[PDB]
């Protein structure tokens, strides 16, 4: 599924992302924008064995098991297929664990490059939620 921006903002707020560990809602909308353009089915194969899955492009070397990735830790304790649903539950649960490491939202390359240090609240402006 490809979300609209305000649709995703509302869903992420219902899924408890606003102010999770200090990160405002716009951070998460911005990260989704630049990782997947709000596409829950996005997948990207990496040069190592791994693949990035779903709306937040969570990687199979570290965070989920797809069975084909050497070095896999499965830190979120899930199959990577769970990250490809129209239901963002599993992606949000895993994202929360990711950001609960000391590296925080720096886990996401797109967030570092396009969101960090900017007015991420622009991504929820004009949304009614």
């Amino acid at each position: 599924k490809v979300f609209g921006r305000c649709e995703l903002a509302a869903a992420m707020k219902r899924h408890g992302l606003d102010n999770y560990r200090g990160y405002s809602l716009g951070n998460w909308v911005c990260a989704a924008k630049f990782e997947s353009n709000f596409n829950t089915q996005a997948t990207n194969r990496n040069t190592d064995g791994s693949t990035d899955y779903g709306i937040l492009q969570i990687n199979s070397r570290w965070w989920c098991n797809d069975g084909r990735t050497p070095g896999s830790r499965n830190l979120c304790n899930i199959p990577c297929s769970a990250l490809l649903s129209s239901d963002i539950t599993a992606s949000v649960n895993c994202a929360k664990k990711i950001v609960s490491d000391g590296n925080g939202m720096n886990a996401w390359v797109a967030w570092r490059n396009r969101c960090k240090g900017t007015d991420v609240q622009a991504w929820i402006r004009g949304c009614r939620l």
Partner: antibody
Amino acid sequence: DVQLQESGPSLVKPSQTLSLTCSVTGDSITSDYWSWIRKFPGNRLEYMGYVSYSGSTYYNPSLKSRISITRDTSKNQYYLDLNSVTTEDTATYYCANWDGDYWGQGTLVTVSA
Amino acid sequence: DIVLTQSPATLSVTPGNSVSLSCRASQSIGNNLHWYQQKSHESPRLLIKYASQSISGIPSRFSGSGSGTDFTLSINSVETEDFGMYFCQQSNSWPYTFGGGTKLEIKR
């Protein structure tokens, strides 16, 4: 099937260090996040801290400067050291994964001379 | 720190009746509220995560609801074996904090 087993002394003298070990099966230490929680006498639970995959630690501010949580993945263990204890540190101590699904059995540690 | 306040302190339940346990947060926590059961001599057992998400193997009679600052654990058709302490815990902000507990006892 992930199993956690706590070990360490049940009696610690005031001003000494309380130390416990959590031994984990089925989940590499560096493949998860790992926590310590304690229950004081009147069902009062305190989340002591956790260590995440990168080795970053989060400690409860109540314990700041007295607590260390460390890891030895080669022994598939992680550790709690709590310095300068007093009778106020008497509690039942638990290790658990950060997700909360897997807990060790609980060990009462009494701080007394 | 976020303070979680549970209600009631004690529930005295007739088996087969349904009950509701409350947990209120001093600051908004979204859905970042988890429920645990603890029997005496046992470790806590996770019942519900993230306010309403089910946990593998937990009986369907346990459910959770709420958001923001107001959360509820519902137990349909309470069984005698449901006797124990029930705690909520928030993970929205560090330090994670627990409610003070609700004791579920059986009426007879």
